[PDB]
Design a protein around this ligand. Structure first.
Ligand SMILES: CO[C@]1(C(=O)O)C[C@H](O)[C@@H](NC(C)=O)[C@H]([C@H](O)[C@H](O)CO)O1
Length: 161
């Protein structure tokens, strides 16, 4: 089950495996693209942030994104997604988190990520052309968990390692 931790790297994860990410600092957690119609990055925002514009390096280039975190005590993982190379990023499906863990999976034509509020998370997805060949760059330590053991992954997301 808990295969890792692996150090930050760019690689092509197998389909139907959760990549469980364990960031320590606010910032970009993971990014992945098919180079055609999906660029996804996950940003971790600290507790308690009134609307402000921040700079992030996404896919090698500096981007300005206006972020907020309404929670006083919980972190906020936000997916930013653009659907063409020169498109703008929009924000989707936050996870409010105490344990500071996130996960992403390639499955059935889509990229799945966790969502909602710990300790009662759900999942959400994004349709992604050529989903199986999406390369991911992790910016923090990560673990690999098969989809068959999703219930273990969900437990870690909800309650921590
Ligand atoms: C086209 O419908 C879908 C999709 O991709 O299958 C449905 C899906 O529930 C939705 N996911 C979320 C978290 O909103 C997703 C995004 O809106 C879109 O991919 C972002 O560009 O759109």
């Amino acid at each position: 089950v808990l295969d890792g931790p692996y150090q930050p790297t760019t690689f092509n994860p197998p389909v139907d495996y959760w990549m469980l990410l364990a960031p320590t600092a606010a910032g970009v957690v993971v990014e992945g693209t098919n180079n055609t119609d999906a660029w996804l990055a996950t940003i971790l925002v600290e507790p308690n942030v009134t609307s402000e514009t921040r700079s992030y390096t996404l896919f090698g280039t500096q981007e300005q994104i206006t972020i907020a975190n309404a929670s006083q005590t919980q972190w906020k993982f936000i997916d930013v997604v653009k659907t063409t190379q020169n498109g703008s990023y929009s924000q989707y499906g936050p996870l409010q988190s105490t344990p500071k863990l996130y996960a992403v999976m390639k499955h059935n034509g889509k990229i799945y990520t966790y969502n909602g509020e710990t300790p009662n998370v759900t999942t959400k997805y994004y349709s992604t052309t050529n989903y199986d060949s999406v390369n991911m760059t992790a910016f923090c330590d990560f673990y690999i968990i098969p989809r068959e053991e999703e219930s273990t992954c969900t437990e870690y997301i909800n309650n921590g390692l």
